[PDB]
Design a protein around this ligand. Sequence first.
Ligand SMILES: [Cl-]
Ligand SMILES: [Cl-]
Ligand SMILES: [Mg+2]
Ligand SMILES: [Mg+2]
Length: 372
Amino acid sequence: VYDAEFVGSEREFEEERETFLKGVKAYDGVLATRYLMERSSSAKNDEELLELHQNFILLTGSYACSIDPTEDRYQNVIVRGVNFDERVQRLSTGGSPARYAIVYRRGWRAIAKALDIDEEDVPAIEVRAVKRNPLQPALYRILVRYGRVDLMPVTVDEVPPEMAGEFERLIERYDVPIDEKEERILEILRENPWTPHDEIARRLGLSVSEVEGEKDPESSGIYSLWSRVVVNIEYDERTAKRHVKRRDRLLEELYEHLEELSERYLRHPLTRRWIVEHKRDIMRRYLEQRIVECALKLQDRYGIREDVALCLARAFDGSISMIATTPYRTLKDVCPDLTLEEAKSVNRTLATLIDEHGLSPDAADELIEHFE
Ligand SMILES: [Cl-]
Ligand SMILES: [Cl-]
Ligand SMILES: [Mg+2]
Ligand SMILES: [Mg+2]
């Protein structure tokens, strides 16, 4: 249920494969640094390691920005059964269905198939870091969706304050209009720019869909507001060029660094060779943490029964936001014991459509799938 066709030229194929494989290697660094951070307290409080982790988050984002530069190299990008070509074709600013997909958890599974990627196990690229993302997270995701290689920083030091804690400066810089709901979201982000979307939604009594919006200026929500801002920023090829030049060298340096640093914390240093060989373990430890955190939150903040909570957490790699924007049928198919009541608690869109607007679950599910 994760598919895409590569429809570019052979030259474009080698370009895309190279970008993707570098992105996978960068994301492996996110996973390997997290592995070390979770295995050792002295490593987790070592600033040198935390900077490595953040720098890998940036390079992953940068490489993801470079996917499908011509916005025509892929066809029928389907993630968990949902066709993103159809999604992106409707939007006022259009764009790449491949990059649109990569910002969703497991989007990489479609693109990896298209590119025949077999160079390592579970060749993932995820661009959804929140906690320790050096950028304001929704902005980071929007840069990826718009292919903004020019704007995505390639080192933590080089993150502009306006893309992080001073994010409100970037919004003000073009005096884009902000809707009332968006202003409510910005209030929460002032308190912590890294507040997760599910929490913003819970705190405002809104659905996750309402908090997020479409990734297009014409919509309403944090993705929509950042899209509004970013389309006003002229594309800077000179800076994109600089970023592309440096990032490949930086990627090597981050790995060399990680290996060195890991030697004083581990009996088995995190060499690139070791990371590739133990990729499945690295990935599964990363996911297990997210899954259990998610399950606990689902049961305590949404009233979901313990077993269903763990089932949903597992199916969606620990993303409450994903769960909260998924059709009822899709959730039930993976987690049979889920009740409609429970689904309405986590996906408030379902509650609004069925309870307030009087749609059948099936009609509600059509809208949630096609239009999210
Ligand atoms: Cl599949
Ligand atoms: Cl060619
Ligand atoms: Mg919701
Ligand atoms: Mg050692």
